[PDB]
Amino acid sequence: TLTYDDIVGTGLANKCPTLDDTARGAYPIDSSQTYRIARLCLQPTTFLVKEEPKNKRQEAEFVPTKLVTRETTSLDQIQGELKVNSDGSLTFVEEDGIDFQPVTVQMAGGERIPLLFTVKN
Amino acid sequence: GLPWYRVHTVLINDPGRLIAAHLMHTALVAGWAGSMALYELATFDPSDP
Numbered sequence A: 001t002l003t004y005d006d007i008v009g010t011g012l013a014n015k016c017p018t019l020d021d022t023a024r025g026a027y028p029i030d031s032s033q034t035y036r037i038a039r040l041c042l043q044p045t046t047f048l049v050k051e052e053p054k055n056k057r058q059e060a061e062f063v064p065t066k067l068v069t070r071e072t073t074s075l076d077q078i079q080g081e082l083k084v085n086s087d088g089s090l091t092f093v094e095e096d097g098i099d100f101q102p103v104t105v106q107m108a109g110g111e112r113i114p115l116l117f118t119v120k121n
Numbered sequence B: 001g002l003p004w005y006r007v008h009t010v011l012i013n014d015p016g017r018l019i020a021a022h023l024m025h026t027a028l029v030a031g032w033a034g035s036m037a038l039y040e041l042a043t044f045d046p047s048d049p
């Protein structure tokens, strides 16, 4: 129900679709039905950079980082056949879609650590 | 002919100019604090406590 001229600017197009609390109602998978996924979206919030542990060998760490490039982070519009193989488990094989958003978070120190948030292939 | 150590004596009386003096050795110190403070800060490494 929302137009681009209605959603542009909110920095909403980077946050993706919710499902209201009428959930927990399982989807009836067949095994007699082909089934595919439509725009699988991964909106993120927590980026943690495993701290290059100092020479000492006691539990390496996973520090929290500050986001830099505003909102250029989330990824969606991912589609792919959703396989229903033996033992009734579902396997989703992505064929294409926007999934390689390049983000750069600022580490504990002043480090600028850039990764390529992606769920490709 | 007033020798240098005697030159800072100038004031002694005239607390006015003197206030501005302490008013300085004070604005000169404070500075040095923030100063090297920045400095040390420009070099302290946190990487490992």
Ligand code: CLA
Residues within 6 Å of the ligand: B015, B018, B019, B020, B021, B022, B023, B024, B026
């Ligand atoms: C209410 C009475 C009162 C108060 C609170 C003070 C306070 C002070 N006097 Mg002082 N003084 C007083 C009466 C007072 N005096 C009287 C009656 C005489 C003789 C008649 C003097 C003669 C005297 C001498 C010779 C000196 C002082 C100095 C000082 C300062 C020493 C510490 C300082 O450098 O910190 C640093 C201060 C701050 C970081 C902030 C304080 C300044 C703000 C709070 C005041 C507001 C700015 C503006 C309105 C000017 C205020 C002037 C007024 C507060 C004195 C300190 C601010 C020393 C000094 O500071 O000289 C520069 C100094 O050498 N006084």
Ligand code: CLA
Residues within 6 Å of the ligand: B008, B025, B028, B029, B032
């Ligand atoms: C404990 C607090 C304290 C005290 C009591 C003093 C007292 C003094 N300071 Mg001072 N100062 C301080 C903290 C203090 N300062 C801090 C934190 C800074 C920031 C760096 C300064 C920066 C400063 C400057 C730029 C000057 C002073 C000066 C002075 C003197 C004013 C008149 C005079 O020199 O008397 C008599 C003072 C002496 C005869 C000098 C004694 C100092 C000796 C111990 C040092 C010997 C040489 C030096 C350590 C190494 C040489 C370096 C090279 C350039 C030759 C006075 C003795 C003025 C001064 O001429 O010398 C003090 C002056 O120009 N101060």
Ligand code: CLA
Residues within 6 Å of the ligand: B025, B026, B027, B029, B030, B031, B032, B033, B034, B037
């Ligand atoms: C009011 C605001 C303010 C605040 C919050 C600070 C805070 C600080 N200053 Mg600082 N500073 C100030 C104003 C201030 N300063 C001003 C106005 C000047 C110049 C006029 C300075 C000049 C200065 C220097 C040169 C240095 C600092 C430093 C510091 C840091 C350590 C100092 C400390 O912990 O001493 C702890 C101990 C005391 C505060 C007291 C020690 C002195 C006592 C023992 C004198 C006794 C008084 C006498 C006995 C009175 C009679 C007692 C009677 C009541 C019984 C700290 C962050 C140090 C630092 O590393 O920062 C970069 C440092 O080297 N400052």
Ligand code: CLA
Residues within 6 Å of the ligand: B004, B005, B006, B007, B008, B009
């Ligand atoms: C504590 C603060 C303090 C203050 C406000 C004063 C103030 C004064 N002292 Mg003095 N004095 C002090 C501490 C202080 N003194 C101490 C601790 C000592 C023994 C260590 C002396 C020994 C002394 C002597 C023998 C004489 C004075 C004299 C004086 C008066 C004029 C001298 C002058 O300014 O030379 C001018 C200062 C210079 C031209 C600076 C050059 C000297 C050195 C090379 C400078 C080095 C300091 C600078 C490079 C950086 C400072 C760093 C700081 C940490 C010291 C003046 C009222 C004179 C006086 O009034 O007659 C009795 C005098 O003859 N003082």
